[PDB]
Every structure is written in C-alpha cells, then in structure tokens.
Design a protein around this ligand. Structure first.
Ligand SMILES: CCOC(=O)c1ccc(OCCCC2CCN(c3ccc(C)nn3)CC2)cc1
Ligand SMILES: CCOC(=O)c1ccc(OCCCC2CCN(c3ccc(C)nn3)CC2)cc1
Ligand SMILES: *C(=O)CCCCCCCCCCCCC
Ligand SMILES: *C(=O)CCCCCCCCCCCCC
Lengths: 117, 4, 62, 279, 266, 279, 62, 266, 135, 4
C-alpha cells in the first residue's frame, strides 16, 4: 500500500527468487525471477503472488536449508517523483495472506507463548 | 445400522 | 445403531475402500466422541465484507 | 472429497484486466491466485485442510491445573487434607491462547484426571492404596470446611471416586453456559454505579468479569484415613473441548498474560531486531 | 450504467442524510446486515419497544484533531451514544436493549497531504489498564462516552498505589490489549488513506453471546482509529486536520421498562 | 490361491533350442527352470511365498531405542529427571539393515513402549506407583528445559501418560514424510556453497543429511514428585512399519555401520577363508 | 462394517472353509492392523529390464 | 463494461508481470502479432529449440536519466539482450534464432513536469558514422548491448585518421541516418507526453528479408527514444527523471546448435 | 573418523568423475582434513559387497562379446522434481570385474569413453543463475 | 457387513 500524497508518482519492482542461488542484491538480479512492476496511481495497492514452487510436497515451519522458500526483494524501477510543496518522503505499508491452495499439517505447540514457574 |  | 463410515486412507498396504464402525453407548450427546468429518466454508465474510463485491480483474476503486 | 482447488494452466496476457492492482482501503483482501500474475501449469491438487478444522485444532487434551492434596494425620494447623480448584482454562497459558483466537465459543468439555503420589519422608512404615474423591461443587452448594465433613456425602453433586494406579479418570460435561455461547472476552461490568448509591463501593465491579464464581469448583480429597507416614499427591487436570464451534476471530496474544483479564505488564517487546534489507 | 460509482455514496437514515464523493466502497461486518430479534431466538417475554426513526438516525460526535503526534483514538458502543437524544433516553429507561450501527468516519485533506488512518470495529474490545492491579479499571473510566479515549506509545504504569487512577493504559502497537496491531485487520475495518479517500463506512450487526443484553453494563463494539501512517503536509511540521465520527443506531429494540438508570460518572 | 508354479513333466531333447546357453552381459538373468536342462516329473506344487511378502518381512516390532529417566530429588547439578530422544531407526542395527534392502519406503508406523524400573540404592524407604509422560515434540515446538516446566502442559503436542505395570503403551503414526516416500538414502546436501559467500562455512552441510531435526523428538519424564529414595527407569521403544511399500532394491550392509551415513571404518573383511576346491 | 474373510488353514482338526472377522474401530487408517492378503508381482523389471526381451530357447546374442 | 480502460494495462509473460495505470493504448507494429515459422516458410531443416517461458519474459535494462541536455538514446535488438539470462545463452549457442518482442518504455514524473519522448521501433536501423571512411563502424562499437548508445546535436567527424575510433555519430534531427526525424513517425511508434502518459508499449513482430537469420551478425529492430519536447519542471534548471526500458522476447525459436559463440567486445 | 563429512566440492567431481581404491586409507591429517570420499572397490564404495551390485540396473562389457553398454535411466526420486544442484539422482559405477589383459604385454591400456544424453528434461523456479563454489 |  502506497501511503504517500496523491501528487506523488513512481514505479516499483517487487520480486521473488526461488531458492538455490545468490539472494538478489541488485534489481538486475531480481528482475530475472518472479516479479511484478507496480505503477503507483489511483488504485493504491499492488499484489505480488509468490507461487508454490518447491521440491518437497510440504515445507517446514521452522528454519531449514533443505526446505527453504527463497527470497523476496523490492527495488525502484524508475523513482518516486513529487512536485513542489509536496512531501518528498512517505510510507509504504505491507500485507500478507495465503492464496486458496494453502494448507498446513502436524498440529504442534507454539514458541510464541510460555509461562514461568 | 446407518452407513453414511 | 452401528454407524459405518469410510476412512480417508493415506498409506496403502499391498493388498479400494476401507471402513470404520461407530456406536454411541451413552444417552447424553456430550459423552460422545468427535466425528471429525467437518464441513468447510468461504473466507468471504472476513476476506471480502464489502457491500458491493467486485470482481478481481476490474478496478477496486471506480 | 476435501482437496484444495486445482491450479489452472494459464498463459500470457496483454489486457485491460489488471488483477495485480487493487485498493486495500476497501477493507478487502485481494482474491489472487498464482495464475493471475504468472504463467502456470495445470496441477491436479490433492492436499487438504483436514487438520486445521476447528475441531482438529482443539482435538487434544491440555493441562489446565495441578491440584495438590495430602494424606496425613489431622493436626490442628493449616494443612492440605483437601483442596479446591475454581474451574477455568486461565491458570495455564497454552490452551488459553488457542481458545482466544476467537471471541465466542460453544462446546462440550472432556476432563481427564492424572493422579500421581509419593512418600514425603524418608521413613515411618508404608501406605495401602489410596482412593481419591473429586467432587464438583456448582455455585450455591455448601463447600467443605473439613476433609471428612457432611458435604462429601455428595448426594446431588457429581463426584468421581478414583483408585490409585487405575487408568486416568475421565468424564464428559455438556455446554453449560448461561448464554448462547461462552464469552472468551467480556467488555463490561457486573454492576453499574448509580448516582443515588450510599457508598461508592456498592456499585463497584471487576472490569471484564461476569459472575463471581463462573462455573464452580472441584473439591479434591483422599478418602483413606491417614497412614502413620505421610503421602503427598498431585491431581493433574487435562481439558479437551469437543463438538466445538467458534465465532469472531481475534489476533493471538503477543505479550505474556498478566492475570484473567487482557492486562499486560512486562515483556512488551515481542519482536526481534532485523535489518530492513537483510534476508 | 448512467454514471454511478464505488466512491460516491449517499446514506439516509431517519431525518438524516450523509453524502460522500470520495469513499472506498463500504464494509458490512462479517457479511451481516443489522436485524431485529426473531421469535425463535427471543428470550425476554415482554413486548419490545422499537423507537425506529427517533433513535435510528445519525448522531455526530465531538470532533477530534489529527496532528503529527496523534497516537490514536477509541470509542465504545453503545457508550459513545449514551447522551444522544432519544436513543440515550431509551437506553437508560430499559434494562435491556439491542442495536446495530452504521459507523461513518470523516477525514478530508488535500492532494498534497499525506497519511493513513486505520479504522477498526472490534467485537468485545476489552482494553488493558494502569496498574499492578488486575481488571481494576473503574466503570466511570472505562466509559468516556462521546469523548472517547486515546492510545499511548508506551506503557506508563500508574504508580500511585495509595490513590489509584483506575484508568486504561492502551498502548498503540499492542491494540491496547496485549496483541499486535498489525493483526487487527482480522476485525471488520477500512483504511482512510488521504490520497484515496475522505472517509470510511462500516455497517455493524449486533454481536454478542446473547440475543439481547444490558447496554449500561456492557459494550458490544469498540471503534479504534489509529494512524497506520502519520499525517504529513508540505514541509509544515505542525499540520492538523479534523477527524469527525458520525454514528447511527440501527434496528434498535428495548425490553424491561422501568424508572430511569442514572449512572455515576464522577 | 497363492501357490508357486507346478513342475511340468519334461522328457529328452535333441534340438536347436538351447536354454542352457546365454549371455549375462545383456544385464539379464536367465529364466531357467529344472525342466529346461534335466528330465522332470510332474509335481503339483503347494508351497507359497506368503511369509516373504514386504509386509510379512517387516511385520515384527523391533527395539530401536532405550531411554533412561530418573525420578529423584531435584539437586543443582546435571541429572536425568527427564530425557529426549530424536526419532530414528538408526541407533540400532537390526531393523536398519532390513529397511535398507530398499532405497525408498512408504508406511504407517506402530510404536510400542515397554517401561521397566528399579531401586537404585540399598535403602531409604520405598516408592508409590509411577506415571510416565512421553511427549512428542515435532520440529519447531518449545523443548523442555526442566522436568516440570510449561512445555509439559502439552496442549497441542501429542502425549502418552503411561502407568507402571499396565500393558505396554501403544500408538500409531501416519505416513508423515515431506516427500512422496521416505528416503533411506539421500545422495546430496541441504546447502550448496556459492562463489559469492562470505565465509565458506555458510554453505557447508553434512553429506547425505536432509533436514536438521528430521521428525522431531520424544521427551520422557516421570510425572510423580520425587520419593525420598531414588527410582531409575528405562523406556524401551519398539518400532513396527505397517501398510508398507518399498522401492529400488539395494545390496544389504556387509560391514559394521559407522554412524547415520553409509560410512565404514573397520571390520571391512566380511568373508571367511575357504579353499577353491573344498566343499 | 464387519469384514469377513477366509483363513488359509494349514493343520486341520478332525472335524472345509474357516473364516475370521475384522472390524476397524478407528477413523484414521494408520490405526489399522495389517490385512496380510498381499499381491505378488513379476520379477521382470529387475531380472529382465531388456528393451528387446528375448525367449529363453533362442540365442541371447544374435 | 465494469470499469476498464485504455490507460490501465497488465502485461504478463512467463514469471513476469507489468502494470501501468497511465498508458496511451498500445501499438502492434504493422498490425502483426509475433508468430513462429510456418512449415511452408521454413528453411533450416533441423528441429528447432523453443525455450518458451525461460526466454520469453521481461528483462529490464539499466536505467538512463533524462535531463535538460539529453539528446536521445538508441538500442538494437537482439543486441540489448545478448547477456540476458537464458535468452542470451540460446542466442549464442545457435547459428540461427528468430524472436519478436514486447517493448515497454517507462517514464513517470508529476502533473507539474513537462516534456515529450518520441519512442520509435525501426526495422533495419542502419546508423551513420565517425568518419571520412564509409561503412567503417566496428562491430564492437555498433553493438553497445544493454548500455545502448546516444544521439548528438551535430556531426563531429572523428578526425584522428592515424588511430580511428570506428564509432557511430548519430545526429538527432537526422535520426542518426541521413533522413529528417519528423518523418520517423512512419515507423511503429508511441509518444510519452508527461501530461498524458507514464509509458509506451510496442509489440514487435520479427521483421526480416528472411524467416530466420543469425542474431549475432544482425540486428532486426532498432529502438530510438528522442526528446521531441525537452524536459522541464517548475523553474529548476537542472531537473532529471529516469527512463527505464523493459523488453520481452516473444515466440523465440533457434536452429543450428553447436559450441557457444564468444564475440570479442574489446 | 568424522561421519558424513565429505565436502560438497569433493562429492561432486563433475565430468571428471572419481575413482575406486582397493583398500581403505583413512585420511589421518585431523588438523587440515581432506573431506574426500574413500570408495573401496569390493565394497561398492558404500559398505555393501560388490557382487550384489547386480540388483541395480546394469550391463557387462566383456571384450570377447561386446564394444559397449547402453542403459536408459528413468528419473528416480522420492519426489516428482527436486534441486539438481543439491542432489544427485543416479550414480554410474564402472568396475573391472575381470582385469584387462593382452598378449603378454604387462602394460596394456585401452580407452573407456562415456557418452550421456539427458531425456524428457523439464525445469521449474527460474531466477538468477546459481554459481557454486568448486574450490 | 462386507464378506470378501
Ligand atoms: C473463563 C474461564 O473458563 C471457561 O470459560 C470455561 C472453562 C471450562 C468450562 O467447562 C465447564 C466448566 C464446568 C464443568 C467443570 C467440570 N464438571 C465436573 C463435574 C463433575 C465432576 C466429577 N468433574 N467435573 C462439571 C462442570 C467452560 C468454560
Ligand atoms: C532416517 C531416520 O528414521 C526415519 O526415516 C524414520 C523413522 C521413524 C519414522 O516414523 C515417524 C517418525 C515421527 C513420529 C514419531 C512418533 N510420534 C509420536 C507421536 C506421539 C507420541 C505420544 N509418540 N510418538 C509421531 C511422529 C519415520 C521415518
Ligand atoms: C445398533 O447399534 C444395533 C446393533 C447393535 C450391535 C451390537 C452392539 C454391541 C455393543 C452394545 C452396546 C451397549 C451400549 C450401552
Ligand atoms: C459394521 O460394523 C456393522 C456391524 C457392527 C457389529 C457390532 C460391532 C461391535 C463393536 C463396536 C465397535 C465400535 C468401535 C468404535
């Protein structure tokens, strides 16, 4: 979500690199993987889907090189352009959710809560 | 019996 | 009163539909086991609670 | 059948239809699938959401209480010849956090009781097998003052008599709420202070609390008369919600619980440090 | 056809009408429109009072200003409307009352201003407090009426033990209740992003574990407005624009009539 | 019916058909039967291969682990008031060798638990019957730091509560692999070293290993509070694969196992000495 | 849901077809016993993986 | 119906998607969409390689800045993509290769900026050179790759006879080739006029006197971007905004596989 | 002494392939380890007896019978598709079941040439190129 | 029932 002023414009490249190579450090490198070129305008928001591309049928919820998911990166495709009397800086808010093919298994306890003696 |  | 249902068979032996039998022994439903044959629903009431629901390929704002 | 939707084969696009752009201000989540923004192959999907169903998520017995009760010679000072526990899922954190992903719930409850015991002291002879009585005292009923007073007669209250070493005791309870659903959260009071009140204590109440005794208590005791030597026992209570329905989802608890309400006190810093451009 | 739009709406209830030329569609919480208690879900046997147009119209609350240091605002329902015309009167003359709501939040600026408001409708919004003392927020403090309350950037524990404030201490990134704000989006909501829209419109059903309850003892819905992205304009470091909240009771009905409840708010 | 093929009556031959000669270079085994090279009678065969079916070969519960856990007074130094075991068939050699006649397998698993205990020391009084908790901790879940900390609440993890003297505990587990089959052998790595890597430790991995925690752990403890005297217990774990399927046969292990991989170290001399022309 | 099958009777008493009964008690197939009625297959994919499979009385090489 | 527009497009090829909210429709050169070689127009008899998604996706070239003195930029195809992933690999492993292209030029600014870019796709764009010497531009200089070349306002003849630069000297009003720029409009084109549009989208068919040819020896299409009207903003005499060129190979096929061609670019 | 310690670069010789040894030489240098395989011939380099390797798909090049062997390999894995850079699916092992001999010349040498063709190849998850470190 |  672009939360800048209406007078602001820009083009942003957002990308996903499946695992196995050097995590992208330049737009040149990021360009080559799954990506979307977001153009800012009246529709305030843009959605990039990260498609299920995996070797295993189910990945793990913990960190593990064997079942890793790859890399997400964002770059300026052109740049933020504003006129005068306008803020030159602004916020971008980000959101995540599952596409309808998403599933989970093996019920387990979370590390996100605990209690003392 | 009741077979579903 | 024996209720017969099908198993969703995952790993299959080298031997088709396999069944399991159930009988409730008690009068109170609270005493009963969990059937675990559960119906799923649309996320819509949470993912799209819009008064005018719009098709994804059209502009969200118009 | 319960498998998830198949991926459709999808090819190149050059069009006025733009699924990729949207406006989250609307309050809505964009319904996109991989085939809307990339070229996809046809996949016949077999995966399913069987284990993340409400029933399956809760279909596990969780520890909600550890009651300690002693069996020893009745002396004249405070002892634990019997103990009482207010029934709740809030003395523990794990099941509480799971139940609280939702505002309202409705279910039957399964209670399983694990009883363990040991010898307190190095030596005074031994003990013959103990039978434990677990009595439910619903709000209103006479509570025990003594380990063997008349309330343990249990003529109308439900009681379980458990024998040590036997399989863990198990009973089932219906949906017993005063409302059409259990409130995991109650934004209110049990009393309103009125302008005409004498002291302003009359109308005071705990915030978020409903009835004073909620669902009553479990009174636990060893029915055996005391051995010459002392035996200490712990009754562990496992709770399982079954035939479950839940309403109005809520964000999970992100900071440590501080009592029965939503109050927080410290460790208000859940998130780790990580660089903005660091994988 | 003709020229209609997602962005342009008119809401009419009773003798009151709202227009908006810069909306972002509108939300109906949990897909459910407000409705009256059905005979087969009824519990109090006495014939209800349905005041209709006299109570189901738009009451506009006092305006709040959004500036660069503004941390956030909260309201509770029915509490924000306790003193609103005949609605408040009906609320206090009866033991029981149910009501749904159309909430309309208003905040316009200019094509050169910047900022985004997160507007969230929360069922049973239990807030956290002041103290070492658990569940100790006093009734009078829990209920600000029209005035609403605010959020803070951090937890200041009211230390004075001897003479306690018995107030809430709602921290912003924890949605005032021990959970992370980023997840508040599971609740019915809209965003007022100044480059996109003037306003948010959320239609709330009556949500409760009961068909009807005591409105004076219990709030059903909480309204939380937090700045997801801070207000900004030109280079002026002290910009301020008004946020105005207008709310309408809907399908209101009341049971258990007697003498009027006069709560003590001091 | 499952009996093996009957022997056919076969008589003298003087012909251009020569079953006896062949060429193994082809990669093939010559399909010969006694009647191809000798005169045979007719035998109605009744023998069958019922007991050498994949299921029958594996249809036996095998010891894969011995977990030791103590119940004694919590002192301040390293003790065994609880223990953890990584689930595997590789801490033992017998079932491992049988499973490894094949590259890939697919099965449900049956776990049976035999629990035995004894008194450590000559004398300090005695012990009331112990209840043991066997908790499964799948990868990701909080592991215990203490024998009675919050993780043992087990709200979502599966746990077995076993009572001493009761019949050996038994549970069943589905096929739980991340792949379509379990790999008994994996010719690869979990990480590749890249040219652009900072240290060359980043991309290092164990050869043949896949995930770090494979299938998680079993945490074992005595739920009883400690007696004045010490009790030592051993939990023996028997594993049985059922509803089994196997792919791509392999030569059996001929030299002693040296860890989880295919590595060998010594006793590389399996075969006995025998004279070429000695019966 | 009772499944009735025949026993392959080895040592016979001085008394024909004898049966045994089976009932699955649980919903999950993993909980089930082993049926042990298993189908056998050809060794061919291992004993003769040839592209041109040849009859044993003819020359293997020709 | 619903709300669709000439100005708002999504282009999806392979694992890549482009959005534009300010387009001016889109051009298909000579009315012809890209296509594969038909059996009855085929010449090399060996079975072709069609890499499909691996090569027919959007590669984004290095960004160039447009400022008040910017005279113009040029690119050649397939040359600009010689080093682009598996497309470049396929190009260099085969004697023959044909490919069409979707060219997408990107340049946004603000309602207060000013300027117009002429974007032209030219079949066989033969450029002029440095010298007294005719047809003397060296292969390495004729082919800048991704980098592209530039235009000049006037003809500077590379004088140094003794050690010649063997470079092009493309003069802007002569389209770098001896003709007047105003007539370049007979070639497939679009204009990026900052008050109207963010971008240009031109779909190029394979154009040649042959069904297939050597891509390493010969460029089929030339892309020329020239400022028809100079960049301007407010009163700031040194404004600069980025131009970004994204290109996708289309219906790519290759013949004559052998060891890889490694040209000398020094 | 170290289990499952063969380094990626050593496990993967590329075109070059590796060799077998007649016996197990344990790389002793602890301090600066070779992290190499030590494949012993009669143990098929993996702790089993070579004579049983015939349960695997194979052919024999017996010089009096044939010039060559031709084996067609399907994709075999516990998965439909996997990472080729992390994991090898098939291993090719050529061992002299019977030693080379000629006339009386004690130092005969003849070439073995291996030609391989990929078949029904397909690829998923395109991005920037993987450049492994083989040093 | 199901008799095989
Ligand atoms: C906020 C606190 O917790 C709850 O809301 C919550 C927690 C538990 C719950 O379960 C029902 C509680 C009442 C039950 C508790 C157990 N009961 C009995 C009855 C007899 C015996 C022998 N043992 N137990 C009968 C009544 C229902 C709601
Ligand atoms: C190479 C190592 O061993 C294996 O590959 C191998 C070994 C064992 C195996 O069985 C499944 C292992 C995971 C199981 C282990 C036992 N489980 C449980 C679960 C709950 C309880 C109480 N007890 N045991 C649940 C998950 C699957 C594969
Ligand atoms: C329906 O159940 C009719 C068939 C009954 C079959 C035999 C039931 C065996 C178990 C007796 C249950 C008694 C439970 C209180
Ligand atoms: C099919 O099984 C119908 C006939 C049932 C006969 C009686 C079954 C007796 C055992 C009851 C099993 C309950 C298992 C959960």
């Amino acid at each position: 979500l672009f939360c800048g002023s209406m007078m602001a414009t820009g083009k942003i490249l957002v990308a996903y690199a499946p695992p196995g190579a050097q995590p992208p450090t330049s737009r040149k490198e990021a360009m080559l993987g799954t990506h979307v070129i977001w153009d800012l305008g009246l529709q305030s928001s843009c959605t990039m889907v990260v498609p299920w591309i995996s070797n295993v049928t189910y990945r793990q919820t913990t960190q593990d090189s064997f079942t890793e998911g790859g890399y997400i990166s964002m770059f300026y495709q052109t740049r933020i352009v504003v006129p005068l009397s306008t803020p030159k800086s602004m916020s971008m808010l980000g959101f995540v959710s599952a596409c309808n093919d998403f599933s989970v298994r093996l019920l387990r306890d979370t590390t996100h809560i605990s209690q003392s003696a | 019996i009741s077979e579903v | 009163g024996a209720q017969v249902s099908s198993q969703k068979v995952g790993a299959h032996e080298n031997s088709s539909t396999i069944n399991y039998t159930t009988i409730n022994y008690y009068k109170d439903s609270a005493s009963n086991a969990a059937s675990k044959q559960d119906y799923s629903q649309d996320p819509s009431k949470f993912t799209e609670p819009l008064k005018d629901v719009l098709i994804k390929t059209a502009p969200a704002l118009n | 059948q319960d498998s998830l939707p198949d991926t459709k084969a999808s090819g190149p696009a050059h069009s006025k239809e733009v699924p990729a752009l949207t406006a989250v201000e609307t309050g809505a989540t964009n319904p996109l699938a991989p085939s809307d923004t990339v070229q996809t192959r046809h996949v016949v999907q077999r995966r399913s959401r069987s284990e993340s169903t409400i029933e399956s998520f809760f279909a596990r017995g969780a520890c909600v209480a550890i009651i300690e009760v002693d069996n020893e010679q009745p002396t004249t000072r405070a002892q634990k010849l019997f103990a009482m526990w207010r029934i709740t899922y809030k003395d523990t954190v794990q099941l509480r956090r799971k139940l609280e992903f939702f505002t309202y719930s409705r279910f039957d409850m399964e209670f399983t009781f694990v009883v363990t015991a040991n010898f307190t002291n190095a030596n005074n002879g031994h003990a013959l097998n103990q039978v434990y009585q677990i009595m439910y005292i619903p709000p209103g009923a006479p509570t025990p003052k003594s380990w063997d007073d008349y309330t343990w007669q249990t003529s109308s209250n439900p009681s379980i008599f458990y024998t040590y070493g036997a399989a863990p005791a198990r009973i089932s309870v219906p949906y017993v709420g005063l409302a059409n659903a259990y409130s995991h959260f109650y934004d209110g009071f049990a009393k309103v202070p009125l302008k005409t009140d004498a002291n302003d204590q009359i109308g005071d109440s705990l915030y978020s609390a409903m009835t004073v005794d909620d669902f009553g208590v479990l009174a636990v005791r060893v029915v055996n008369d005391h051995n010459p030597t002392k035996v200490t026992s712990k009754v562990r209570i496992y709770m399982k919600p079954k035939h479950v329905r839940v309403w109005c989802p809520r964000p999970p608890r992100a900071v440590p619980y501080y009592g029965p309400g939503v109050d927080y006190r410290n460790n208000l810093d859940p998130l780790s440090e990580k660089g903005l451009t660091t994988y | 056809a003709c020229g209609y739009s997602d962005r342009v709406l008119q809401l009419t209830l009773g003798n009151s009408t709202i227009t908006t030329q810069e909306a972002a569609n509108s939300v109906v919480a949990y897909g459910r429109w407000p409705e009256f208690i059905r005979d087969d879900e009824a519990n109090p046997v006495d014939q209800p009072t349905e005041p209709d147009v006299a109570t189901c119209r738009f009451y506009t609350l006092d305006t709040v200003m959004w500036g660069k240091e503004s941390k956030g605002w909260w309201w509770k329902l029915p509490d924000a409307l306790r003193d609103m015309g005949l609605f408040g009167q009906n609320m206090y003359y009866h033991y029981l009352g149910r009501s749904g709501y159309t909430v309309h939040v208003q905040c316009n600026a200019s094509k050169f201003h910047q900022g985004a408001l997160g507007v969230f409708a929360i069922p049973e919004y239990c807030l956290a407090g002041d103290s070492d003392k658990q569940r100790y927020t006093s009734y009078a403090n829990a209920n600000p009426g029209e005035r609403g309350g605010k959020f803070y950037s951090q937890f200041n524990k009211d230390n004075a033990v001897t003479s306690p404030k018995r107030e809430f201490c709602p921290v912003d990134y924890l949605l005032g209740c021990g959970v992370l704000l980023g997840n508040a989006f599971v609740y019915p909501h809209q965003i007022i992003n100044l480059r996109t829209n003037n306003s948010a419109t959320i239609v709330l059903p009556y949500v409760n574990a009961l068909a009807i309850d005591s409105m004076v003892k219990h709030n059903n819905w909480g309204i939380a407005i937090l700045p997801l992205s801070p207000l900004d304009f030109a280079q002026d470091s002290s910009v301020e624009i008004p946020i105005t909240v207008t709310i309408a009771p809907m399908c209101s009905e009341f049971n258990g009539l007697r003498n009027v409840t006069a709560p003590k708010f001091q």
